[PDB]
Every structure is written in structure tokens, then in C-alpha cells.
């Protein structure tokens, strides 16, 4: 593994021993999946290994995650759950025990929640949980309804949204310690208290700690002037928002040229 | 180069142009199936014929490990920040040892200016809140 990697794995193992559940927020490219695989490997008492590992990742990340399991360790067995109703139903019937890890999308878990309910789950990790910020969504409630002792996350680039996001994140981390949204809102001073509260059950690396040789990307802006037709349309408009940005980006959408 | 866009209509116009000029055209949008995604992503490592790759932010940037590319071009702006960030990093990860450069085609302060200002303010916030 790596230094930071091993340290995060040890922190996760210590939190598991203490029974705490937390996030694993690191920059993209630092090896989140590798750290999760190492943490899964660390389990040797035959407690989590005996049961399954529900990995609820986004749809796009099904194949890379899958490959990562088929290459990182020749021991873990994957039982993908994403595809035609037939194949998925057959896979569900199969375990209905070598079901080590399971790969499923967010929508597939919510739709087929009943299938997952009848199966007990030793460990659950929901990668890329940056989507799980709105508590009013059905996804949040469905994820909350699962009966799992330990919850782990590998979501990156956290927060940055409104306080709603923060309420959702924290209340998911633990049902206790958090009661109402406005309450959380009530709890320089504010920022320091929030940092102190989130310090124990969270990590962070950034790019300087882990990037030992990574050229600092160069970001370049480029203003572009609107053309004649674009201006005639912008004038018409001036004299909504979606239509507006469209007319800007390109006019063909509202006025494909004729013959 | 990796081009990122949002509107499928836009993507289609861009496709039309990339067929007018011969630069090759390989896309993987949200309408593409997961198997076709996985396929194109296997191709774009260990294959070099694809000059340019056409993605959308939510569909492709998050979790696709596109280290092969050296440059990223954002044709359009996003209201919520940390979304072009996913793409940026997806190209600037660990296997991108060649170079990293992220352009940003914006307009001359027409209506994009408000979006860029909001994005900069939100990025500054998210920067200082927890770091």
C-alpha cells in the first residue's frame, strides 16, 4: 500500500473497534478504492469476511470498481447487480455463501430495495455519496432504512453546498447527536466548533501531503465574443435562463438555418 | 484533449462538426449504456487512435480514471462548483504523468459572468470552510 493509505486503514480499523462510523474524504486520484480494499482485507477475524459487502456505487463506476476487485486481491469474489431484469433476477436468486462483495447503482438499490431487505449485510460502503445531500429524496430514506451495524463512506469533494447537505451528511453518519435541522444551524466561533466536532470521525489529505511528484495543473480562462446573429438574438431576448444560455452558447437551437 | 459539455443538443452539434472535420469522435454520455461506457473506457487506455473524447460532467467525469489525456477543455460553465472539479481531477489523478492543463471557454461577460462569479464565491467558501 502507501503510508497515508496504511494510516487511514489503521484509523478505520480503530473506528470499527470503537464502533464509530465516519467518512473517508480524500482528493481524487489518491487511492480511495485502494484504501477501501485494504480496509476490507484488514478484516481477518472472520466477522465481516463471512458476510457480504454491499458496495453502493454510482452506475458509471461499476466496471472500474469491478476490475479493482478482480485485480487487487485474487480472493474477494464479486457478484455484480446491474443489467437486464433477467440477469439481475438470476443473480438475486443465486444467493437467495460466496456473495463476498456486491456492486449496484443508486437507482437499482432503491427500486429493488425489497430484494436487499431480505438479505442480511455484514458491511456497507456507499462510494461517491456526494449525491446523498437532499434528505427529502427517496434515496436518503431508502438508504437510512437499511439495517446495518456499520456504515462506511469514501465520498470525495464533500459539502460545498448549503447547510441542508451538512444536516443530511451528519444525520446519516449517526441518527443520534443530531435531532433537527434548525438545531444544527444553531450549533469564527461557529466554524471552529464545527471543525472540532468533525475532527475525530473524519480524515483529509489534500494534494500536498500525498502528491510527491504531480505538476500543478494550469487553469486558463478564455473569453469569447458573440457573433452578429448571436447579437441580433441577444437584442431580441433583452427587448428566461435556459433559453438565454442556449441562445448564447449557440443560435442553431432556436433557429436552424434554412435552405 | 478531453472535452466536457452539458447539453446533449450541444454535444450533437459538436459531433456534427467533429464529423465535418476529421479529428475522430468518441463519446460516452448518459444515454450510452453501461457496457458501452466500460468498453470505451477500456479502449481509451491501451488504445491511441481516439484523439479526443467527449464527455458530460455527471455522466463521465465522476469515477472514470481518464489519466491518458493531458488537457481538459470545458466548453461550458456549471452553476454548482465542485462538479468541473471531479472532471479536472479525473484527468489530473495519479497516472497523468505527461501534463495537466484545464482551459475554460467562457463568454465576454454576457450572462456567463454571473455564473463564474457565483462559482468563484462558492469555491472560496468550500475552500475555507474545512481547510
Amino acid at each position: 500500500l502507501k503510508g497515508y493509505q496504511l494510516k487511514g486503514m489503521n484509523w478505520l480499523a480503530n473506528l470499527y473497534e470503537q464502533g464509530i462510523n465516519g467518512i473517508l474524504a480524500d482528493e481524487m486520484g489518491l487511492g480511495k478504492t485502494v484504501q477501501s480494499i485494504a480496509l476490507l482485507a484488514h478484516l481477518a477475524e472472520r466477522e465481516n469476511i463471512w458476510g457480504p459487502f454491499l458496495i453502493i456505487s454510482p452506475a458509471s463506476t461499476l466496471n472500474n470498481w469491478h476490475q479493482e476487485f478482480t485485480r487487487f486481491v485474487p480472493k474477494f469474489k464479486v457478484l455484480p447487480y446491474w443489467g437486464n431484469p433477467h440477469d439481475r433476477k438470476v443473480i438475486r436468486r443465486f444467493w437467495s455463501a460466496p456473495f463476498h462483495v456486491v456492486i449496484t447503482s443508486y437507482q437499482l438499490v432503491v427500486q429493488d430495495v425489497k430484494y436487499f431487505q431480505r438479505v442480511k449485510w455484514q458491511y456497507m460502503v456507499l462510494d461517491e455519496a456526494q449525491a446523498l445531500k437532499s434528505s427529502s429524496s427517496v434515496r436518503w430514506k431508502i438508504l437510512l432504512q437499511f439495517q446495518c451495524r456499520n456504515r462506511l463512506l469514501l465520498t470525495g469533494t464533500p459539502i460545498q453546498n448549503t447547510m441542508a447537505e451538512l444536516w443530511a451528511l451528519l444525520h446519516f453518519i449517526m441518527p443520534t447527536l443530531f435531532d433537527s435541522h434548525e438545531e444544527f444551524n444553531e450549533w469564527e466561533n461557529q466554524l471552529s466548533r464545527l471543525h472540532m466536532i468533525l475532527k475525530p470521525f473524519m480524515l483529509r489529505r489534500i494534494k500536498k501531503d500525498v502528491e510527491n511528484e504531480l505538476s500543478d495543473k494550469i487553469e486558463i480562462l478564455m473569453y469569447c465574443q458573440l457573433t452578429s446573429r448571436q447579437k441580433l438574438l441577444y437584442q431580441a431576448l433583452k427587448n428566461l435562463v435556459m433559453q438565454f444560455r442556449k441562445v448564447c452558447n449557440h443560435p442553431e437551437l432556436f433557429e436552424r438555418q434554412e435552405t | 484533449v478531453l472535452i466536457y459539455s452539458q447539453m446533449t443538443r450541444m454535444i450533437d452539434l459538436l459531433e456534427e462538426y467533429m464529423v465535418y472535420r476529421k479529428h475522430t469522435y468518441m463519446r460516452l454520455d448518459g444515454s450510452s449504456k453501461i457496457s458501452e461506457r466500460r468498453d470505451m473506457v477500456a479502449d481509451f487506455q491501451n488504445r491511441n487512435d481516439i484523439f479526443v473524447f467527449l464527455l458530460s460532467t455527471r455522466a463521465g467525469g465522476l469515477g472514470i480514471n481518464l489519466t491518458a489525456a493531458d488537457t481538459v477543455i470545458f466548453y461550458d460553465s456549471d452553476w454548482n462548483p465542485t462538479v468541473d472539479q471531479q472532471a479536472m481531477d479525473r484527468a489530473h489523478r495519479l497516472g497523468q504523468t505527461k501534463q495537466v492543463t484545464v482551459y475554460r471557454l467562457i463568454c465576454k461577460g454576457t450572462i456567463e459572468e454571473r455564473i463564474l462569479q457565483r462559482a468563484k464565491e462558492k469555491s472560496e467558501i468550500q475552500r475555507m470552510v474545512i481547510s
Binding site: 455484480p80 440477469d87 438470476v90 443473480i91 | 457496457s35
Partner: peptide, 29 residues
């Protein structure tokens, strides 16, 4: 008498396992 149904049971089980393996190797690309 019940041995024939038991053996049919495990041959159905191995057929199902073969089908699952076929689905998995189709899924592995």
C-alpha cells in the same frame, strides 16, 4: 426413492451455478 429427487436437486443447483457463472463472464466484459 427420495435419492432421485435429491440428486435432481443438486443437478439443478449446479445448472443454476453454471448459468450464474455464464452471466458473470458475460458481465466481465
Amino acid at each position: 426413492l427420495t435419492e432421485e429427487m435429491l440428486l435432481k436437486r443438486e443437478e439443478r443447483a449446479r445448472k443454476r451455478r453454471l448459468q450464474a457463472a455464464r452471466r458473470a463472464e458475460e458481465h466481465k466484459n
